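Field: COMPLEX_INPUT
Field: COMPONENT_COUNT = nine
Field: RESIDUE_TOTAL = 546
Field: MODE = joint
Values follow.
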Amino acid sequence: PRSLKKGVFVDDHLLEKVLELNAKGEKRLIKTWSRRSTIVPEMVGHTIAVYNGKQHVPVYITENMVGHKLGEFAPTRTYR
Amino acid sequence: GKGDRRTRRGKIWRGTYGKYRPRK
Amino acid sequence: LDLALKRKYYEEVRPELIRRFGYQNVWEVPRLEKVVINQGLGEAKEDARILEKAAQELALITGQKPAVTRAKKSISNFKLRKGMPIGLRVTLRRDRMWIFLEKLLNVALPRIRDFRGLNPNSFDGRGNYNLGLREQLIFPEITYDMVDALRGMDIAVVTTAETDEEARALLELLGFPFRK
Amino acid sequence: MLMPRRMKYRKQQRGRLKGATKGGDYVAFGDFGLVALEPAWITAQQIEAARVAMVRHFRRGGKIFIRIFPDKPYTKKPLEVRMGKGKGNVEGYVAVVKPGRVMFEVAGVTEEQAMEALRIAGHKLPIKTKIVRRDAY
Amino acid sequence: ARIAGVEIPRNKRVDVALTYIYGIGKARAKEALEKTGINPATRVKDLTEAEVVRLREYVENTWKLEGELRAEVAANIKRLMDIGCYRGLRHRRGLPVRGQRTRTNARTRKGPRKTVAGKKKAPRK
RNA sequence: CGCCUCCUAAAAGGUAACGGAGGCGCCCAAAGGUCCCCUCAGGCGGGACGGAAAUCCGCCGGAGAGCGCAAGGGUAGAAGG
RNA sequence: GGCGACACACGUGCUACAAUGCCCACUACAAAGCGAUGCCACCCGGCAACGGGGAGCUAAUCGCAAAAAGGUGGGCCCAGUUCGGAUUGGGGUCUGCAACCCGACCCCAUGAAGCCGGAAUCGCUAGUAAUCGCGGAUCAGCCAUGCCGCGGUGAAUACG
RNA sequence: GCCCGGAUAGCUCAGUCGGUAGAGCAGGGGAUUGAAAAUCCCCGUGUCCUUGGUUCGAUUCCGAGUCCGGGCACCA
RNA sequence: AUGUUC
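Field: COMPLEX_OUTPUT
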């Protein structure tokens, strides 16, 4: 259903980031503090961090994740 | 069914207008 | 009869083959060989009679009465004590296998359990091919027919087919698509 | 560790007696050959008692060819007079042995380890040996 | 009788066999009768052969489904474990790829149960 | 403790010892007279319910199949199906 | 990230065990509420949700609201079924700036289960049981099937 | 070490003639009780000594030994 | 008519 037409949701800084890469070049990979935002193409492969509330859980971002978001590929919570 | 939709025995114990509650 | 395959291959397949490949002798080209029909289940003396129930419909269904193969012994048997029959069989080369199939093919086929695909890969490597099954009414002259009945079956085929090269050749020849 | 046995998968019946086949064996498949002396039926034991010392006396390692096989264990009725059965069964297996018959062929180590190899191997037993050469390969 | 891969339905009125199929969204049905009108009040048995046919290929050709329903089945789930989705460790672990509760009911992917034990002297409530 | 196949047994035939490894004291009306008929085990693969093994066809492969029940010989110009 | 962790044991609520169960065009009737920056008439796009848009009352004329449980005609033939919801995929939605963990839905497809549960342990002597519903608080928007509150129906039975 | 007889699940033991394996207990858990013991309820954990045979089939016909019990070893 | 514990 993917609701919220446009304007959906993203931050500010993070963008200043991608654009850099999609400007000066792909350069080096990166990292992140918290979480909560949708996915796009211009950024994929270009993996980075995703410090899950407990310990770092970054995703070598890809395309399977077409236009989904971070919700599904944001692993955490004990087990085994 | 009781816990089932697309009728009224559900739309009642749930709260859901939809194409199943307008008028004209 | 004097319809499809007839003035088909025998006036059309040939005039194609021609340049559509470099052939030599006639009785040594993508000719033909035989039409094989066979079946098996797993049950034996369930009463010994049910067994003849199949015996009833089946064979005549095609339009031919074949030879039998039932029983072996009241032994343990690894894959069931069953008396140990097997099934039955028979074959043909006459127009019974002419118009007979014209129908079962262009008709029974596509009303398949999932159209938009054909198995031209269950091939061997020569005029040897094989495709199992598990239908019944799908037949043209036998649509529905014997609900009280019900069972599985299977088929085999033979041609010169140096390999499935002559096999698949017949494939697109008059249908028999590629599973994709 | 390593306490098993070794003998034709299972049995192979239990019966035989002897000869002398005044020796045998051909060229070789390996290098510095080990040539026999004495004609007899041999023991799993004597075998092991040899490659041993050699091997560790072959620190970094060793290696040699092992031509032959097991054939018949034996009898030897433990006590009293003598009648039936076949004691001495799962007791001791013998390999077919011909006078001077070949037995082994070293490598990797030259007449430093290989010399003694044979000069200690033989010693391990009553009979002795010599080296390889050519003959045919 | 084959409006698609073997359409066994036969022995009643349209308003009898119908959607008891698998991939069945009663919508297009009121379309066979909407866009056109191949009504419901016709006993399958006599379901006018004219209706019969036009209905057959009606949704036999072009209309992908049934078998293709299975298609996505994999894509969704399978595509998730070939990748890196958490819901992915769900379907792939007998876990109901729905995302709801915890320790309260499984009967979604796997099912039933196998027990172990409890702290020596472990009560009930 | 009577007999059945091979070993021992030293190539005619025989050959012994509380020496090794196996057997029978039944069964058959059809497992029997008689005439036209196959092939095998099986390796390959093609191929619903078929993981060896459901089953079937083409290749090869002559007996290792196999022929009341032990072993042995004979044997597909089969006794043998 | 996290108490909305998972292999299994007790409870207490909502439903299938469906053919007095089935659905609809339509058509009939309670109390308690609760309305302010509040209940939104009503035309409609929309099959719909939503939303647009706009009056009342400026407040018991203006809102929730229509009804529900019925009537009826019109339509299945105990099949584990015009049964059933797990469930599984998505398409829009919507307060919250924003709902992956977990949001509440308009709408498309899915058929676990299961013919009433061992041994048991549960209310209640009159509207009594049982039943179909509507409004209270809380939360900004919520899975509150909560407990709160009110009724259009409405049986048994008790030697002792 | 002679022979006869002897190795089922946790273990106390069945299984006349082979082809859908038990009970007694056992323990598991629900239903108890204030709690607990006596229950009522329902189940599944065995390669029936490895290994080697017939038969299509072996827990039951066949050997091997690790072991298990009975009898076993006297004038001399 | 038969029934044990803290």
